[PDB]
Design a protein around this ligand. Structure first.
Ligand SMILES: Nc1ncnc2c1ncn2[C@@H]1O[C@H](COP(=O)(O)OC(=O)/C=C/C2=CCC(=O)C=C2)[C@@H](O)[C@H]1O
Ligand SMILES: [Mg+2]
Length: 529
């Protein structure tokens, strides 16, 4: 029998039959006039009424541009009001947003555009070159938020549409609304189908209930420095923020001065961070010149945090409850959330990544035997609930290997749950590398390396790094007679991938250690490194 773990919070009613926009704006009448989005770039403020109206206008505009229910748009933008309007606009149409890092290489953007069948790409003028040829050859519309080059439209073509022209639509709970990409537990990035039902469930698990797990209210100011094109910010900052009527303070890029100035100036109360930001707060001499006493909740997620950096937060944010959230794109994303963040807070331990969310089930499974494990025993973390993905787009085989027929998602993460129902992640079974919280799929890099005429075999694994958490490193077997150097391997990769996917070290070996099936012995390589 499976040994099942649950939240210390009771299950709540979740209205996950509601479309995502209907749910997130369910209580909008209570805070219609309140600030919703604050753009750090220009200090422009949109109210809740503004954001709902602009999203509806954009929905009508997208319809006019040919977006029908179940069609997909690609958002290729930094954090911005336009990102939000495009995302919520598509939701109103029963359509799908796929989201991508605007700093991706042309090849990376186009691969995702093709895989997702995006009909429109929403971007900035400076990135049109990345997609223009592909878009022309495939009649993909390009919409620019700043200025429109030839063969492109301006975003005003969407915002100038009449909100009353949103077509009648019957959106279903299992309809897809968001399509972030993730490599999951092995292989290449895949389209994660996140549904209305799924995202409503995930948001509710965090912010709804008499005692919400993550207590945020309509007088809070939440920093949005994490990228909205990744699921952590998209769900836990934007969607959760909207649901409770919080103000969301958007930053386009991290820089330490702007970060500190915005916190102090706007009296930021919620700080959703990742470990590199925590480390920057730890190290920067200028931090002591700022008043950070407004911050009442600091969360770290996306990568392990550690003890030294937890001490940093305590010292630098004297009024804050500090803790972690643990998510995975396929999981909706939140698996566990620090109960110190609750309206009636629970005691927590350092190094814990939270307690499994309410309205969900967790088990810990031994990879060797397949047996479910009791408390205080490490194994693979698995989760079950309405919040998880529908599956991978056009990839039932990968879906079947990732979520079983009893509804269990296998995370590829190793951890244990203690007597206080606190979850600790201790290792990663899956091949995924995390650079500053960003996914680096070694299979992608390995495919590139094997394409080189002078490389016989290759394996990409994480190496521990202070600044980035992990960096990708390559073990490379040179072809016979090859003299390819570390720098030459690095340059070959660097010309083809976004910065964070870059190989930081190459180790040249005679053979890549492999299992008798033909699979890389990655744990052995990590032990060596
Ligand atoms: N807290 C964590 N500690 C150790 N590791 C963590 C943690 N959170 C995520 N990870 C790692 O990233 C993987 C998931 O990567 P992915 O990019 O798909 O998703 C994410 O990283 C999402 C994280 C997140 C979302 C919402 C939120 O509120 C708090 C955190 C996990 O399987 C695990 O290996
Ligand atoms: Mg319906």
């Amino acid at each position: 029998v499976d040994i099942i773990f649950r939240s210390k919070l009771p299950d709540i009613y979740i209205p996950n039959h509601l479309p995502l926009h209907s749910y997130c704006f369910e209580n909008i009448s209570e805070f219609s006039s309140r600030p919703c989005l604050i753009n750090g770039a220009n200090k422009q403020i949109y109210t809740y009424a503004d954001v709902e109206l602009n999203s509806r206008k954009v929905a009508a505009g997208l319809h006019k541009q040919g977006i029908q229910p179940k069609d997909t748009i690609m958002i290729l933008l930094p954090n911005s009001p336009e990102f939000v309007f495009a995302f919520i606009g598509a939701s109103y149409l029963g359509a799908i947003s796929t989201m991508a890092n605007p700093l991706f290489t042309p090849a990376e953007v186009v691969k995702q555009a093709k895989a997702s069948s995006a009909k429109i790409i929403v971007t900035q003028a400076c990135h049109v070159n990345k997609v223009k040829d592909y878009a022309f050859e495939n009649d993909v519309k390009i919409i620019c938020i700043d200025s429109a080059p030839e063969g492109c439209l301006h975003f005003s073509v969407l915002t100038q549409a009449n909100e009353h022209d949103i077509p009648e639509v019957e959106i279903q709970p299992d309809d897809v609304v968001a399509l972030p990409y993730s490599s999951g537990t092995t292989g290449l990035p895949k389209g994660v189908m996140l549904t209305h039902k799924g995202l409503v469930t995930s948001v509710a698990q965090q912010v709804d209930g008499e005692n919400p797990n993550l207590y945020i209210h309509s007088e809070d100011v939440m920093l949005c420095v994490l990228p909205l094109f990744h699921i952590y910010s998209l769900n836990s900052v934007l969607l959760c923020g909207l649901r409770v009527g919080a103000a969301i303070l958007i930053m386009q890029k991290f820089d330490i001065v702007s970060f500190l100035e915005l916190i102090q100036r706007y009296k930021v109360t919620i700080g959703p961070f990742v470990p590199p930001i925590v480390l920057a707060i730890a190290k920067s001499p200028m931090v002591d010149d700022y008043d950070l006493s407004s911050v009442r909740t600091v969360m770290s997620g996306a990568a392990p945090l550690g003890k030294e950096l937890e001490d940093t937060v305590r010292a630098k944010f004297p009024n804050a409850k500090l803790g972690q959230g643990y998510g995975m794109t396929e999981a909706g994303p939140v698996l566990a959330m620090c109960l110190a963040f609750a309206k009636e807070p629970f005691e927590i331990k350092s190094g814990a990544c939270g307690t499994v969310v309410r309205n969900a089930e967790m088990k810990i499974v031994d990879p060797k035997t397949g047996n479910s494990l009791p408390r205080n025993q490490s194994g693979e973390i698995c989760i079950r609930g309405d919040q998880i993905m529908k599956g991978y787009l056009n990839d039932p085989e990968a879906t079947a290997r990732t979520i079983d027929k009893e509804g269990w998602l296998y995370t590829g993460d190793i951890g244990y749950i203690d007597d206080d129902d606190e979850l600790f992640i201790v290792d990663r079974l899956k091949e995924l590398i995390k650079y500053k919280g960003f996914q680096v799929a070694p299979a992608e890099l390995e495919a590139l390396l094997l394409n080189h005429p002078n490389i016989s075999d290759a394996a990409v694994v994480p190496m521990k790094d202070e600044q980035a958490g992990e960096v990708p490193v390559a073990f490379v077997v040179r072809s016979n007679g090859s003299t390819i150097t570390e720098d030459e391997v690095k340059d070959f990769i660097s010309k083809q991938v976004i910065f964070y996917k870059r190989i930081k070290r190459v180790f040249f070996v005679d053979a890549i250690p492999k299992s008798p099936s033909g699979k890389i012995l990655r744990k052995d390589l990590r032990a060596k490194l």
